[PDB]
Amino acid sequence: KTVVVTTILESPYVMMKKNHEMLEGNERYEGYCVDLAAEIAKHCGFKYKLTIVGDGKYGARDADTKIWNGMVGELVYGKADIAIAPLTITLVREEVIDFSKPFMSLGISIMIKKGTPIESAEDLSKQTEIAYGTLDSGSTKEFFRRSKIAVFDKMWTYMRSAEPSVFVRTTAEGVARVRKSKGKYAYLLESTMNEYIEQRKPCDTMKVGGNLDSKGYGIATPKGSSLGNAVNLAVLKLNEQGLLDKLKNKWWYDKGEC
Amino acid sequence: KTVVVTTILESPYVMMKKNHEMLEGNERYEGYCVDLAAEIAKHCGFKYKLTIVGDGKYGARDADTKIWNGMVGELVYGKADIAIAPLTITLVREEVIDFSKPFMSLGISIMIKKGTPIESAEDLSKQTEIAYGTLDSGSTKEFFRRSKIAVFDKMWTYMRSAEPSVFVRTTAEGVARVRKSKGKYAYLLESTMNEYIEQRKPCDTMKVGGNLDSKGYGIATPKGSSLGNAVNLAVLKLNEQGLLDKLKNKWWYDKGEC
Ligand SMILES: NC(=O)CN1CCCC1=O
Ligand SMILES: NC(=O)CN1CCCC1=O
Ligand SMILES: NC(=O)CN1CCCC1=O
Ligand SMILES: NC(=O)CN1CCCC1=O
Ligand SMILES: NC(=O)CN1CCCC1=O
Ligand SMILES: NC(=O)CN1CCCC1=O
Ligand SMILES: N[C@@H](CCC(=O)O)C(=O)O
Ligand SMILES: N[C@@H](CCC(=O)O)C(=O)O
Ligand SMILES: [Zn+2]
Ligand SMILES: [Zn+2]
Ligand SMILES: [Zn+2]
């Protein structure tokens, strides 16, 4: 039976094709996670259907209602068989869904407009002129909200109370804010998305400093789903055959313009 | 019941304390994986005993006999309940044991004596003056055995037939051979161990070029044992709390001598 795959529109993992209107089904989409879903499906031996997640979120649990939103939600509540996306493996998510071993490494990083007087996280903590935020419902926001560590715990104190809000709805919103703010706003986001943007015109942003942490993206399935086993084996095989490295180069760098 | 942990002596993961002679049991050893074992046992609430793996190897399958040796063998045949060591998550191993999510990242790298006229794998591949090899019964050697990638496959074709053998029993032996070969031997080994050695006296070796792949170390349990769930969740918590980052600086860079 056809596997229903939940994913998210995030460049350059899944993107609308130039002529998306004149194509049907899986043919409408392109990018890193679209190529990877075909590979996974082929080595696992299953047919599938790409679906963009209705609310455009990665997944968080609403503290009052306790309902999970985003892709995690689609898995938790039985709307999807699998998620193939830049979804971060975390402890609170591993408690309700299953993840395959990481297919991509990454860490929280800092994006600035070129020329901003900022070199690190500790530089961001002890200053007020330059504002900074993160994406609204993901692992990046929760890392800061959950952190005991100094610089980060103080950064959270700041962001949660900042006005107007320093959080954004989408990555594009974060980046557009960076570009328009003449260096008066820095954006905290995963190193992978920071690196992609740095290679796109107008070439006016850049990643500074080392990463604040170190984690991975995994293919997620409903807790105890049988599919888990085959897809984990598939990711390891495809890393070992060099597939994942080829794909990153194709979509990040063989694409450069800066 | 007391947990039998199988491990390997490999700096700076597990090493003998200076005054080992006068100490007993777990107190004999120190290092990154020694601290990580305390931490895992603390959070999971089990008592444990560290045991250095009998044959001194990581684990590979004899193609004639089909018997697994090393730490992998200890788990496969029931000599041990858990393996806490720099054990590489691979596809043939995940078929017979379980791995936690990665506690540390790394790739195959190149170690040269300072001054050796080599920057990359492609370099090594196109010449015979400088010999090169890897550890026995580990994941690096098997990386080169199963390479379809153009450059690596040629390197293996060279290595397997090379003579006298370019392969070594242990890391120390590999590193001693670099140091004593006046630049006529390069050693292929994980970036992690490479970066450690580069920081220690006599300070005569170095990591050149970029990593040849990208993979992870995982905590290993016999297939479908109950321990695995707890330890997986523990690794993720420990990464999320920054402890894994504390440990790596403690053992790697706080230790610098060059
Ligand atoms: N101790 C560390 O290396 C800390 N950092 C470096 C990159 C990301 C990670 O958590
Ligand atoms: N899934 C993860 O835990 C991945 N990361 C990044 C490197 C090691 C760490 O645990
Ligand atoms: N596109 C990617 O997944 C590239 N990388 C990151 C580590 C595993 C893989 O080969
Ligand atoms: N295309 C790549 O990223 C290849 N490399 C670089 C880091 C390790 C990996 O396999
Ligand atoms: N456990 C792994 O497969 C780890 N590695 C290194 C970075 C991501 C990749 O797949
Ligand atoms: N000691 C460590 O494992 C340090 N690093 C590497 C990736 C995970 C972690 O934060
Ligand atoms: N990868 C993140 C989304 C982006 C972010 O939080 O910065 C997640 O899965 O929650
Ligand atoms: N970490 C490797 C051993 C080191 C190597 O093969 O270079 C393994 O688990 O087999
Ligand atoms: Zn459109
Ligand atoms: Zn394929
Ligand atoms: Zn602790």
Handedness of CA B91, B94, B100, B103 (dihedral sign): negative
Structure tokens at B71: 């730490």
Taking Cα atoms as reference points, which of B51, B146, B244, B33 lies closest to residue A240?
B146
Binding-site residues on chain A for chain B (CB distance < 8 A): 89-91, 94-95, 99, 101-102, 105, 143, 146-149, 213-216, 232-233, 236-237, 239-242, 245
Secondary structure element (H or E) that encloses residue B97, with its range:
strand B97-99
Stated resolution in angstroms? 2.1
DSSP output for B182-236: TTSEEEEEEHHHHHHHHTSTT--EEEES--S--EEE--EEETT-THHHHHHHHHH
Structure tokens at A147: 């952190």
| B121 contacts B110 by C-beta, under 8 angstroms | yes
Taking CA A126 as the corner, what is the angle to CA A122 and CA A128, rounded to the nearest 5 degrees? 125
| B112 contacts B194 by C-beta, under 8 angstroms | no
CA distances from B254 to A94, B12, B19, B131 (A): 33, 12, 21, 33
Structure determination method? X-ray
Q: What domains lie within chain A, and their CATH numbers?
A: 1-106+216-255 (3.40.190.10), 107-215 (3.40.190.10)
Angstrom distance (rounded) from CA A159 to CA A168: 12
Helix (H) and strand (E) counts for chain B? 10, 13
Judge: B214–A101 Cβ closer than 8 Å, yes or no: no
DSSP state of A139: H
Type of residue at B33: C
Binding-site residues on chain B for chain A (CB distance < 8 A): 89-91, 94-95, 99, 101-102, 105, 143, 146, 148-149, 213-216, 218, 232-233, 236-237, 239-242, 244-245
Residue of B nearest to A142 (CA): B240
| B212 contacts B121 by C-beta, under 8 angstroms | yes
CA distances from B39 to B1, B36, B44 (A): 18, 5, 9
Structure tokens at A103: 């297919």
